[PDB]
Amino acid sequence: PSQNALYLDLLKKVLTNTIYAHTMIGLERLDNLQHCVEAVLADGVPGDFAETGVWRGGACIFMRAVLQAFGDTGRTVWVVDSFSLETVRQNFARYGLLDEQVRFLPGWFRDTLPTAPIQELAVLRLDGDLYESTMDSLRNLYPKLSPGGFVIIDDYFLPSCQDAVKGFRAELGITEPIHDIDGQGAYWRRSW
Ligand SMILES: [Mg+2]
């Protein structure tokens, strides 16, 4: 049961500034994110959503929007970065989604992630340009990812991102198969 499809379709057009830019991830990667979120809602995987490396906040805005479209009032979207914080907050306000289901964690990943007030995740999304940001994010938040939760890495097929993600998976003995999105990003679903 796919609620408010027209709304999310239009929002993806708007976030990518194709109407006449709040995200640069493009439509295919927004599509991916939509399917992943609609899956954890439909399948009842518990947990919040979190993005580390958020740019103008678009992907997090969209995640909040899918919660809106499906009438889920319980889950939180965690917007995690070093920031322009007020600018991001105002981007949420523009779509009318700056509310209690959106939480901000500003700071160096070094300091914030270790102690993050997050208990469990259904979705974990990373814009993994850099080794240390990627490792800080995965090491601290993957353990919070519920069974059936998704991990999405936006820059996966960058060789250096790929090496870092592979190293992390080896460390923890993660073998859930990786899936390509668009030749740039990738994701996998934590086994049940
Ligand atoms: Mg990226």
Which DSSP state fits 116? -
How far does residue 22's CA lie from ligand 1's centre (Å)?
13
Give CB contacts under 8 A, 24+ apart, made by 93-96: 95/11, 95/14, 95/61, 95/65
Strand order in the sheet with 48-52: 102-106, 77-81, 48-52, 121-126, 145-153, 186-189, 179-180
Beta bridge partners of 150: 123, 189
**Contact residues for 5 (Cβ-Cβ < 8 A; gap 6+):** none
Element at 60 (helix H, strand E): helix 58-70
Question: Could you give the CA distance from residue 78 to residue 150 in angstroms, rounded to a whole number?
Answer: 15
The answer to whether the annotation marks 188 as part of a ligand binding site is no
**Contact residues for 100 (Cβ-Cβ < 8 A; gap 6+):** none
The answer to whether the annotation marks 127 as part of a ligand binding site is yes
The answer to whether the annotation marks 82 as part of a ligand binding site is yes
Tokens representing residue 46 in the block: 């518990």
Q: What are phi and psi of 22, to 5 degrees?
A: -75, -20
Nearest to 74 by CA among 105, 49, 111: 49
How far does residue 155's CA lie from ligand 1's centre (Å)?
5
How far does residue 15's CA lie from ligand 1's centre (Å)?
15
Element at 15 (helix H, strand E): helix 5-15
| Method by which the model was determined | X-ray
How far does residue 127's CA lie from ligand 1's centre (Å)?
4
Tell me, what amino acid is at 55?
Answer: W
| Residues 185, 15, 121, 131, Cα dihedral to 10° | 40
